[PDB]
Design a binder for this molecule. Structure first.
Ligand SMILES: CC(C)(COP(=O)(O)OP(=O)(O)OC[C@H]1O[C@@H](n2cnc3c(N)ncnc32)[C@H](O)[C@@H]1OP(=O)(O)O)[C@@H](O)C(=O)NCCC(=O)NCCSC(=O)C(=O)O
Ligand SMILES: CC(C)(COP(=O)(O)OP(=O)(O)OC[C@H]1O[C@@H](n2cnc3c(N)ncnc32)[C@H](O)[C@@H]1OP(=O)(O)O)[C@@H](O)C(=O)NCCC(=O)NCCSC(=O)C(=O)O
Ligand SMILES: CC(C)(COP(=O)(O)OP(=O)(O)OC[C@H]1O[C@@H](n2cnc3c(N)ncnc32)[C@H](O)[C@@H]1OP(=O)(O)O)[C@@H](O)C(=O)NCCC(=O)NCCSC(=O)C(=O)O
Ligand SMILES: Nc1ncnc2c1ncn2[C@@H]1O[C@H](COP(=O)(O)OP(=O)(O)O)[C@@H](O)[C@H]1O
Ligand SMILES: Nc1ncnc2c1ncn2[C@@H]1O[C@H](COP(=O)(O)OP(=O)(O)O)[C@@H](O)[C@H]1O
Ligand SMILES: Nc1ncnc2c1ncn2[C@@H]1O[C@H](COP(=O)(O)OP(=O)(O)O)[C@@H](O)[C@H]1O
Ligand SMILES: Cc1ncc(Cc2csc(CCOP(=O)(O)OP(=O)(O)O)c2C)c(N)n1
Ligand SMILES: Cc1ncc(Cc2csc(CCOP(=O)(O)OP(=O)(O)O)c2C)c(N)n1
Ligand SMILES: Cc1ncc(Cc2csc(CCOP(=O)(O)OP(=O)(O)O)c2C)c(N)n1
Ligand SMILES: [Mg+2]
Ligand SMILES: [Mg+2]
Ligand SMILES: [Mg+2]
Lengths: 559, 559, 559
């Protein structure tokens, strides 16, 4: 009788759940799983740190709508990955962290095993579910559970512990075929009641000044034409969140993005679609909402998200496709939004964009560019070349890029997310490149970049069409903070370094851009090349403000 | 009334407990703490990732015997630091992680605060104690509790949560000076009973083939002359664990390190001093210990470490200085270890060292150095220049350096430790440089290096006398693994990159060493320059073996 | 300005969410909440132990479909309640545990506060969400979050921490009335996709030997006519799990309950409605299911329950009323189940029931009733008086009562549940009595009874129409285990005690039933009296078997 082992059953189980790519860092006890995966013809991206393989997995999940798979070693490697699993779960990104672990006998008696840790229990706060597969016969079911938990309900992270003993277990090929199965409909549709839809439809119909807020949950849903059809048929102004940019084109005529404060302050009804009323929306209270409670319609898959911050007048619980699809029919033939309202917002949008256009054309000294004229170059490129992933993180580098760089296609803008994480950059580039097979542009704050910078080599090693733009202002927010004591560098200062040289250290192409013309020429050549590039964009050290747009959240001493 | 605030009471409380240095990364809500720390005249080291600021804090704790302090932001930054705290606790290194956290009310209802996380509860598995200081009046007590918990008993990590709202609370200066206090005897001696020492003394006096095993707990204790006096007076052969190297000079004539397998297998009594019978010692069982239970004598401050893995015949619970001092007096005038035992080991040491000398003189082609002739250069340099910290990590780069590079001085060798962590390299360098004010050499596997490599810029930014030697073999264990499929790079491969160029991108000095002679000149020049340097040492891709010495711990397929 | 406080906002918030009843035990810091709850005109039931107040809350949640509310003190009282919350979550019973907690500042520094515990963090494994309301202004949102979390998705427990300092905070009455709100649609319908229903419909239409398995999730859903209509229209044989008894009347002609082993072993398609393929169903494998994978159809609100144990061919995710309604319409006009299948089962049902009738008429000596003739009396009484709650727990007392005592009405049988808990008896009685306003019979193993027996006094104190039948066989499973040593009582033995006398000690009516005729008169008189009664039913000590039906799950020595 012919035998197979744990390595193969696991490989077969992943493939059966439509997984063909893993991001990770090898080592004991899983190096030979990584190799065999590759030998089978599947893809393995080796990183320089598991955190970044983890961030890659998380955004592969967002883009594709099937969980990104990260593979790590035990204890220290697991720890690094689980930080990324935590981020995924917070952002509602389907992801599976697979980690090897040590001997149950020794771990459970805390005797000091190789890389000892109860990884299953340590993972619990950072994921939807944390499982362990102890036996070969249970791998198919174990992977089904993981995939299902990651993509169903509110998508998120799942941890799957793989004890070292799992892989060397053997079983007959015959009984293995018997156990292998493909889960049926692991991310099922969830349809809301007629009366939940009728209530939301009544709120919208009777609204005087409605706004729609599109969150990245709406973008994740992959029902772009449904969402666009709803906006366009209702004639309701809309506002995208950071990663919902491009869901509808950011230059769509009903976009009130460029007059956001006035839109949220003055609206009466606000339709949240896959967007949480969390810190990014000021918890639905305070000055940004006119110091009043709006009438909210909220469409979310997670029932207990409703009323999490403010009372929701019309909670619609289900998957965005099903809910939006029904709401559209409910509103079919109803009057479009008030022209005095939509025309007021559009007038303030035109004025604000003209003010931005002026700033983007402004002339700065060589090597002392600002956030407007440098990112105006990226803006122009992304308007002509929209089928490109835009990775973005930083403070000023983030907030100015979100404002300035218009996205015309959905799920292209990949950014710091719900936790405002510095560190997602290079991992995000690898996964975007891997899953799209298309170019990536990253607009990186220089401090932001240093959290994942060593992964430039990973990008070079796989010769990915990634162009990393460093907003090199020489620090955190600013590059010019005075020495606090004599000979002592301020804590916010960073070396205004030759990041272009670092890229060329690993076979990449490096550029320095001292002006918008240099930045444009370099960007066009880098993207055209299809090769790994870095552009060291020299920004005025004094051009940024403290914490970007969220300056007011800083705690300052008044004594 | 003259008011002070939480920022300043915290600053003062830390200083009262002899803290003058923090390692971290700034941001909301803790940037102005960092600023004010520096304005006061204390050191803040800003890093590129909080994890490396944390590894830095952990080894500062080891070297100094006073808690290394790491400062982070909430959720994502906290998480990065807590991975290092975990490592500190596992290694018994005193360390305090201070992190800002968000609004109690919003985090507790999970409404989606800015960087929302119950950081206090997430730290719990990764430290000795996890605390939160909520009120200004409790800062001095909170800091006392953290310092005592980190340094007393078995030393380790402590998390201290600092809500955003702590810092802007106010109090009168004479109220604050009333609360401020310095703890008495935060790491007290703990003396063992006379019968504990007599039981140990009896076993040693009756041993036919005794060995002493020194662990890093023994090194941490800073009683080097006392431990050396015990070794010499007793005549007992000794072996250092990785970081206990140099506690006694590695070329001490009683060292059995060059004959470890034989010593441990054939001994009858084994005296453990601050060394756990964990995976590094194969749990005191199996062929490493001649397939039998030795008579173990164990000195440890942790009562319940006793009998963790094998029965301990002479458990001695107390601090190592106190214990060793009593054991010495209990053994006064006793005959020295059997001369035919000490003679047998010495001969095998001489034989094996001579055999290693043969390999270190071996000649290799340009750019294809092996681990013996490359590290033979570092060996000679460290013998001539012993007062230098030696950071080390990797597989072959770690195992070969521990064997070849002799330490003559205590607490200089700083390595991957209990969890065999890749990632500790550049933080360890910063901390060693900071707390010693003397040079640092790092011997880095190239894979290992990539876990903290971006921190080269941090080393350059503070102009530290650090020399990074990259053992550049182009991969994990080996740099020559065949492409598993046409055009697909193996998972164990890395770019054989110009790490020298990367160093020079941030103002550091970079070198390529293709031969031992080039390595020698470069290392001598690098250390003598007193500046940040990186030597890219070109190692034969086929020179290393899988996992170095712990290759049998791999799980391999057979089916 | 007219002020209100936390006590009153909390009272008002609970009432706004349709809460009129709490079960608990008073003390610091929550006695005056209890008092004021009552002063307002709402019910507070004081118990003798918080655990039983909690089991009471859990079954009130099951019966009503709105969260049962338990109130406790900090640490020790909280802990007792949280054991019941754990049970609620495990059984999918909506329940809120409110507990007072101590001072944030003292608990967080672990200084030793009055009843010190991070109760929020200790509850986490035992509920769906663990929250803390810190501020008066967040009470209405906090209570909304708890009610939604408990009732939505898969229903379950929620912990709500109430620091001592919450209650004495104040706010203006018109501010409080501005914050107070009632959540819209806290338990929404969730409708499955048409293809989910069509896949299920296809399998049922092609089944040769279909069965439907009803679980307590189906009973909880309160769509009894709809589920009965499905069973009748399809002609499919059905089986109820313990607490699904009476969903359809147990004497329904399509019931296969009296032929369970054969039905499950020989079926081809098995339709699971609110029933998990857990230990109670042997995980869908082994000889119980003919050693094969059936084609499972499963209706469950929890997406990731699918494929938890065996592959589900037709997963239908959504609320059971919505799902069953669609499945019925999808099966309209389909032929009824194979008559030779339904005929085979019916014959075996008739045979086995006739065989059970033989045992129930059996004659035993005075004071040595068996489980068949004693429970045969309860069977006849419940057939004649079906609108009564039947609480049940024990081993033989549980298994024999589930077999013998037919339920004609839904949500009346209330038993040990998913964890096979001993202890739920007297709390279940109090809650059933409270929420139904109708009589309650408890059939208690004597061991089982002792876990909550002191609550007899609580039943008497509220003069509830509860009749406790103690199946008094003098022990665990059996009352006759030999003394293992001279003068030493066996561990399985109990005093064959005068539980009647115990009842009468608190003003209850007590009976001894030594024969079925005495049991009948006593039960008839007890229930008709409308007063608290206990019937001490004398059972043959040798009548029961080890663990009842789950005796093969015992671990026994063979060496
Ligand atoms: C919280 C927010 C959602 C709040 O939104 P706002 O910033 O107010 O709005 P936007 O960014 O959409 O737009 C900014 C302003 O420019 C306007 N705007 C937008 N687009 C345009 C165009 N095309 N033309 C002209 N003007 C425009 C818009 O109306 C706003 O002005 P007004 O109309 O005047 O309002 C956002 O700031 C955000 O997503 N931030 C993420 C921050 C983060 O995570 N940072 C990393 C951590 S920093 C950190 O942790 C630390 O420092 O420490
Ligand atoms: C577990 C161990 C303590 C076991 O010790 P050993 O390796 O057996 O002993 P040592 O390293 O002390 O010495 C190695 C051998 O060289 C001999 N030796 C030592 N010094 C000398 C000199 N000066 N001259 C000649 N010979 C010498 C010694 O007697 C041993 O041979 P014999 O006496 O003949 O045996 C050690 O391997 C260790 O500390 N490993 C850490 C590994 C690690 O953490 N790696 C990173 C993760 S790797 C990973 O995670 C992954 O691969 O995945
Ligand atoms: C917190 C305490 C240590 C505080 O000590 P005190 O109560 O102040 O002191 P003592 O109890 O020792 O003594 C009480 C007083 O009587 C005096 N005293 C003591 N002994 C004597 C004799 N023999 N003769 C005369 N007087 C005496 C003593 O001086 C005190 O008065 P003065 O000189 O005038 O001070 C104690 O109360 C305690 O241990 N409490 C435990 C409470 C508890 O856990 N209860 C259950 C929870 S109730 C609960 O949770 C809830 O209600 O809810
Ligand atoms: N298919 C889906 N249907 C409905 N809601 C979804 C779906 N996928 C994700 N969501 C929801 O979308 C939300 C994402 O919100 P958030 O991450 O705050 O977006 P943003 O930051 O852009 O506002 C979550 O509340 C999540 O439950
Ligand atoms: N001052 C001290 N006195 C006694 N024991 C100590 C002291 N400091 C640390 N220890 C103990 O020393 C041990 C360190 O062991 P370990 O980390 O396994 O060393 P190694 O890895 O070098 O063998 C721990 O068990 C710890 O409790
Ligand atoms: N309203 C509802 N609609 C659909 N499924 C539900 C509903 N309420 C509870 N459930 C589900 O019903 C199941 C109850 O199963 P279980 O407790 O195993 O029942 P039993 O023990 O009777 O077999 C759970 O899986 C739960 O998710
Ligand atoms: C994991 C983690 N650690 C720290 C932080 C705190 C932070 C927020 S923004 C930032 C860097 C901002 O400077 P950058 O150079 O990137 O952008 P710019 O304004 O253009 O100069 C840090 C360190 C966060 N959010 N996450
Ligand atoms: C956080 C973490 N993730 C992975 C690993 C697993 C590992 C152990 S050793 C190693 C690299 C070995 O290659 P290196 O180049 O450094 O040395 P050399 O043999 O001379 O070529 C890895 C990735 C560990 N230990 N910790
Ligand atoms: C909280 C808890 N602790 C222990 C147990 C274990 C147990 C299962 S059944 C049982 C008692 C069986 O005797 P009983 O008198 O009730 O019934 P009978 O067979 O007719 O004599 C116990 C103690 C469980 N399930 N829960
Ligand atoms: Mg910057
Ligand atoms: Mg290498
Ligand atoms: Mg009994």
């Amino acid at each position: 009788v012919e035998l197979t082992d744990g390595f193969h059953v696991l490989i077969d189980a992943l493939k059966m759940n439509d997984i063909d790519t893993m991001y990770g860092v090898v080592g004991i006890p899983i190096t030979n799983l990584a190799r065999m995966w590759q030998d089978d013809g599947q893809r393995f991206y080796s990183f320089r740190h598991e955190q970044h393989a983890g961030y890659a997995a998380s955004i592969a999940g967002y883009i594709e709508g099937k969980p990104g798979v990260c593979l790590t070693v035990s204890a220290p490697g697991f720890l690094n990955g689980v930080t990324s699993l935590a981020h995924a779960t917070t952002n509602c990104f389907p992801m599976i962290l697979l980690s090897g672990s040590s001997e149950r006998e020794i771990v459970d008696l805390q005797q000091g095993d190789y890389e000892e840790m109860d990884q299953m229990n340590v993972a619990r706060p950072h994921c939807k579910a944390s499982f362990r597969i102890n036996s070969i016969k249970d791998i198919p079911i174990g992977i089904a559970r993981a995939v299902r938990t990651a993509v169903s309900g509110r998508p998120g992270g799942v941890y799957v512990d793989l004890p070292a003993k799992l892989f060397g277990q053997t079983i007959s090929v015959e009984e293995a075929n018997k156990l292998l199965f493909k889960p049926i409909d692991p991310a099922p549709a969830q349809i809301p009641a007629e009366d939940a839809i009728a209530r939301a439809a009544d709120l919208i119909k009777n609204a005087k000044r409605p706004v729609i807020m599109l969150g990245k949950g709406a973008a994740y849903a992959q029902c772009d034409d449904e969402i666009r059809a709803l906006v366009e048929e209702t004639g309701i102004p809309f506002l995208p969140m950071g990663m919902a940019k491009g869901l509808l084109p950011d230059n769509h005529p009903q976009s009130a993005a460029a007059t956001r404060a006035f839109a949220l302050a003055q609206c009466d009804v606000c339709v949240l679609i896959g967007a949480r009323l969390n810190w990014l929306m000021q918890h639905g209270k305070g000055k940004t909402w006119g110091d009043e409670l709006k009438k909210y319609v909220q469409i979310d898959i997670q029932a207990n998200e409703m009323d999490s911050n403010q009372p929701i007048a019309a909670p619609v619980v289900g998957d965005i496709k099903s809910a939006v699809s029904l709401l559209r029919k409910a509103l079919k033939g109803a009057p479009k939004a008030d022209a005095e309202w939509t025309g007021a917002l559009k007038a303030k949008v035109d004025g604000n964009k003209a003010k931005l256009a002026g700033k983007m054309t402004a002339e700065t000294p060589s090597g002392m560019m600002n956030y407007s004229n440098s990112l105006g170059v990226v803006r122009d490129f992304m308007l002509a070349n929209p089928d490109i992933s835009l990775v973005n993180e930083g403070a000023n580098a983030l907030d100015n890029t979100r404002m300035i760089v218009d996205m015309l296609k959905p799920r292209k803008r990949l950014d710091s997310g719900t936790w405002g994480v510095m560190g997602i950059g290079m991992g995000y580039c690898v996964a975007a490149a891997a899953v799209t097979g298309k170019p990536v542009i990253a607009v990186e704050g220089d401090s932001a970049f240093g959290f994942s910078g060593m992964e430039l080599e990973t990008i070079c090693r796989y010769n990915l069409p990634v162009t990393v733009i460093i907003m090199n202002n020489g620090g955190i927010y600013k590059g010019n903070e005075a020495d606090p004591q004599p000979g002592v560098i301020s804590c916010t200062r960073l070396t205004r370094g030759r990041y272009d040289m670092m890229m060329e250290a690993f076979g990449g192409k490096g550029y320095v851009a001292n002006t918008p013309a240099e930045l444009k020429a370099a960007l066009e050549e880098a993207v055209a090349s299809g090769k790994p590039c870095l552009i060291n964009a020299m920004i005025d050290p004094d051009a940024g403000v403290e914490s970007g747009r969220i300056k007011s959240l800083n705690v300052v001493s008044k004594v």
